[PDB]
Write a protein that binds this ligand. Structure first.
Ligand SMILES: Cc1cc(S(N)(=O)=O)ccc1NC(=O)COc1ccc(Cl)cc1C(=O)c1cc(Cl)cc(C#N)c1
Lengths: 536, 402
């Protein structure tokens, strides 16, 4: 019983033509199985025996209930079919599920094969059952329904479904039906029996359109298995992630491991993979065996212990506040937890140290907020009220003066050290009395030889001859000198267009050691006034 | 319906829907179930792989705002009305939204597919709701064009009655310009709305006041080594626009290694040089003329403290216009708002002056901007933009504006 569902208009890509690949040869055995199968599918109404009026052909295969099944390779036909509106690529995050009294999962079953093919288009799907060891004329057919493996099947199926449910969702506003691939996660707040009845209604609505569905016979029971998660009636939890103990760890092994650990970092507090990753240094092959260092053996242990902790979460209740709190776990690394009621976390996660060319903590804080906001908008259609380890004063002082448009939605301070601050602030005006170094560097970009010295008003002088430098390291090195060689108060003038950079962004972390060295130095002074003057 | 097509070899837009708020999705869903019923739009299948972004802007009433920037670019041309030079010289211009006018005219059935758009769902708990226009869409370039005959018609009677009043059409907008005093003006605009309203339409710039502001250089009792440096820097960079600007005499005073804080006495030659430089800066650079065949570029620098500076130009340093925009009441804690606000403002000026929108260079990170520009958008059109890293001197120089 297929379907009184109106077909979808499928056309071949711009001006191309249906596939014409030759039928792969098969054994009398495999053949006899395919004949069997197609004879069944012939009657279920799924395929139709056609004839000579079809130049099109796709290769059928026989793979093994250990019973013989079939596989049609549409690879060609697909690359020659039109493009469809991409089917849902974003998958629901449990934390975004509103807690319901009951939820039912209904996998639609004989999904594709159950829906009509555009009768025009069927011809292109014709394949052929070989004859006994490549001697002439065997059985020929084509598809009357979405073929398993064809490009438009998923999108077409999704649609048809969506259509069939429009009514139900209309007549049952307080019922919720999530759609995902071939599944319907149906949840409500009715009573166990009311719910049970409404499900049977749905099911029967679908059956009246060609979609078979589970009964309490086959229909999944919680906890629900769903992408590293266990879905319970009042909480979700992460499904156990097991680190196998071995005495021989290949490169492949340590990588797959580092990976599962990194994923774990999102949920579990304390995972670390520094010494593990350390094992990858110099590796000559995925199959290479690399002995774990002591340090390595240890963190792996500690991780085995963190991982055996019961982290769990709650579901979303639209009536309560959304609150995201951020912590700075190491330079550029951030952790966040998003909840409604304290300690009852809806979701957590961390953002890896984003090794940049040059930023500062307030900038990165800002960015973690941006990420969380988008994440939140997606998951809940709202944006969290923030709890950030940063003083409104520091924020105002920074943002209020940064060359770039920046922003943090509504948030509030929370003193959970370490706090994000500004490591230093360049002076707004020259420092009276404070020394005035006139810095400079020049390097033969070609020879990578240079010097970078300074001369202060006070007489003090210097210059260093450098090996390996593009003027930019000299320049900066110039400035670096001027910083080490002065008091806790200095005025440095330069022609460096790049230093001008620092001025406007006062970075507190960079890609280059140099900038780092300078930064370290900047932080030590009590006052620094950086000034730029045109070069020459 | 008039057959419309995409420019040679250009295929349809397939831009992705940015995630929206629950607040906003419920509104689009409402607006869309309505329009659906009235036959303005129809749900569509998966065979349609095109798509344009949609959002809701702000009564408590929410409006639908589709972004056909891509489809506009991909849309054949129709060679709109010639820009009326005098519009810029009026004492007051009003903008009215005539997008409602299009819902009337049907859309060539063959073009529809391309107008497909999607209403997203919180948590991907469902596929989007897909539609495609059955009538002219607001924000599509081919709409005001295709409704041009019909528009002029409905307009004449009001122009003749008031021929001292100018009307110019940009997309969904109508810019009406007169010289009457505020009251006589506004009452006369309502006389225009009323006129428009008896068909199906519905809803305060002062161009002559937009002044061309110069660069003023600092004046001081005493000048320090620092003061002179900074000054010599602004001048230097500026020598890129006015090449007569000289810094030799000044740069002389700076010879030697003295404390930034030390006061330097100004030589008479040095004083002339400054005086001469104040003189050069007293007027915009000569030789800058608008070329309709070139793009318009609008660059903006955040001066901080809620002030913003901008330049519209086609050729680097050959500015068509320049300005500053100081934050409006309420935006205190919001850079994003002032910026989108400034952009709308600058873009309307450009429409008024040359009848086309400028391309923008915005000093904000793409993520920040994409995540929140809607929250404050209020116009029917949407300019083109690109994100950049503000050179510290173009900034420093324009904060020097009078
Ligand atoms: C897990 C559970 C069990 C029961 S009960 N008492 O029927 O066992 C009731 C509610 C719930 N769940 C909730 O309260 C919150 O979750 C939900 C809220 C509404 C809906 Cl329709 C589904 C869920 C799910 O649990 C769910 C979601 C997806 Cl995307 C896939 C799968 C999958 N696979 C299951």
């Amino acid at each position: 019983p297929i379907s009184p569902i109106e077909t979808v208009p499928v056309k071949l890509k711009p001006g191309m033509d249906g596939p014409k690949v030759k039928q792969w040869p098969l054994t009398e055995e495999k053949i006899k199985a395919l004949v069997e199968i197609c004879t069944e599918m012939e009657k279920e109404g799924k395929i139709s025996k056609i004839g000579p009026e079809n130049p099109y052909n796709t290769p059928v295969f026989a793979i093994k209930s250990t019973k013989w099944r079939k596989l049609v390779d549409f690879r060609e036909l697909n690359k020659r079919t039109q493009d469809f509106w991409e089917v849902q690529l974003g998958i629901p995050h449990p934390a975004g599920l509103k807690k319901n009294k009951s939820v039912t999962v209904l996998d639609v079953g004989d999904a594709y094969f159950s829906v009509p093919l555009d009768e025009d288009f069927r011809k292109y799907t014709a394949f052929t059952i070989p004859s006994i060891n490549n001697e002439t004329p065997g059985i020929r057919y084509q598809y009357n329904v979405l073929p398993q493996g064809w490009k438009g099947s998923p999108a077409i199926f999704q649609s048809s479904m969506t259509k069939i449910l429009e009514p139900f969702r209309k007549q049952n506003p307080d019922i919720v039906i999530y759609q995902y691939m071939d599944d319907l996660y149906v949840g409500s707040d009715l009573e166990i029996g009311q719910h049970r009845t409404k499900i049977e209604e749905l099911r029967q609505h679908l059956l009246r359109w060609g979609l078979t569905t589970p009964d309490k016979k086959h229909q999944k029971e919680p906890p629900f298995l769903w992408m590293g998660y266990e879905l319970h009636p009042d909480k979700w939890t992460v499904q156990p992630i097991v680190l196998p103990e071995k005495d021989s760890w290949t490169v492949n092994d340590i990588q797959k491991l580092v990976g599962k650990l990194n994923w774990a970092s999102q949920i579990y507090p304390g995972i670390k993979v520094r010494q593990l990753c350390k094992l990858l240094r110099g590796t000559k092959a995925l199959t290479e065996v690399i002995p774990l260092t002591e340090e390595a053996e240890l963190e792996l242990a500690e991780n085995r212990e963190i991982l055996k902790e019961p982290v769990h979460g709650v579901y979303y209740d639209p009536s309560k506040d959304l609150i995201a709190e951020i912590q700075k776990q190491g330079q550029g690394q951030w952790t966040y937890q998003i909840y409604q009621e304290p300690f009852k976390n809806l979701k957590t996660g961390k953002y890896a140290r984003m090794r940049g060319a040059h930023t500062n903590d307030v900038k990165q804080l800002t960015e973690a907020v941006q990420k969380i906001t988008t994440e939140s908008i997606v998951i809940w259609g709202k944006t969290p009220k923030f709890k950030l380890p940063i003083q409104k004063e520091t924020w105002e002082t920074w943002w209020t003066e940064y060359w770039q448009a920046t922003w943090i939605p509504e948030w509030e301070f929370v003193n959970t050290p370490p706090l994000v601050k500004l490591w230093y602030q360049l002076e707004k005006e020259p420092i009276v009395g404070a020394e005035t170094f006139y810095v400079d560097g020049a390097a033969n970009r070609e020879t990578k030889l240079g010097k970078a010295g300074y001369v202060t008003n006070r007489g003090r002088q210097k210059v260093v001859t450098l090996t390996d430098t593009t003027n930019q390291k000299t320049e900066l090195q110039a400035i670096y000198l001027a910083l080490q060689d002065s008091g806790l108060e200095v005025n440095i003038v330069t022609d460096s267009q790049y230093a001008l950079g620092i001025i406007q962004a006062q970075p507190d972390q960079s890609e280059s050691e140099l900038v780092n060295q300078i930064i370290e130095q900047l932080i030590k002074k009590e006052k620094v006034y950086l000034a730029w003057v045109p070069a020459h | 319906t008039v057959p419309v097509k995409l420019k040679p070899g250009m295929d349809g837009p397939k831009v992705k829907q940015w995630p929206l708020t629950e607040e906003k999705i419920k509104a689009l869903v409402e607006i869309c179930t309505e329009m659906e019923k009235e036959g303005k739009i129809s749900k569509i299948g998966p065979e349609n792989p095109y798509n344009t972004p949609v959002f809701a802007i702000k009564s408590t009433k929410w409006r639908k705002l589709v972004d056909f920037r891509e489809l506009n670019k991909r849309t054949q041309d129709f060679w709109g009305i010639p820009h009326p030079a005098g519009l810029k010289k009026n004492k007051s211009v009003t903008v009215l939204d005539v997008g409602d006018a299009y819902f009337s005219v049907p859309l060539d059935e063959d073009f529809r597919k391309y107008t497909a758009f999607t209403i997203p769902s919180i948590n991907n708990e469902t596929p989007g709701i897909r539609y495609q226009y059955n009538v002219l869409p607001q924000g599509w370039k081919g709409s005001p064009a295709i409704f041009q005959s019909s528009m002029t018609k409905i307009l004449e009677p009001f122009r003749k009655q008031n021929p001292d009043i100018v009307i110019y059409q940009y997309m969904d907008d109508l810019y009406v310009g007169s010289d009457l005093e505020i009251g006589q003006h506004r009452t006369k605009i309502e006389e225009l709305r009323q006129h428009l309203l008896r068909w199906g339409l519905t809803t305060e710039l002062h161009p002559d006041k937009w002044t061309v502001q110069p660069i003023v250089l600092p004046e001081k009792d005493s000048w320090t080594v620092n003061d002179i440096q900074k000054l010599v820097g602004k001048l230097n960079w500026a020598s890129q626009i006015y090449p007569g600007i000289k810094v030799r005499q000044l740069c002389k005073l700076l010879r030697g290694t003295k404390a930034l804080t030390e006061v330097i006495p100004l030589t008479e030659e040095a004083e002339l040089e400054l005086a001469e430089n104040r003189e050069i800066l007293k007027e915009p650079v000569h030789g800058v003329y608008y070329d309709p065949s070139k793009d318009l570029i609008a660059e903006i620098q955040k001066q901080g403290q809620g002030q913003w500076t901008y330049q519209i130009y086609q050729e680097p340093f050959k500015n068509l216009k320049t300005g500053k925009y100081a934050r409006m009441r309420g935006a205190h804690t919001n850079d994003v708002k002032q910026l989108t606000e400034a952009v709308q403002k600058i873009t309307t000026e450009s429409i008024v002056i040359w009848g086309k929108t400028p391309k923008f260079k915005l000093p904000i990170q793409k993520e920040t901007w994409e995540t929140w520009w809607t929250e404050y958008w209020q116009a029917t059109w949407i300019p083109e933009w690109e994100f950049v890293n503000t050179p510290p001197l173009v900034k420093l120089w324009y904060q020097l504006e009078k």
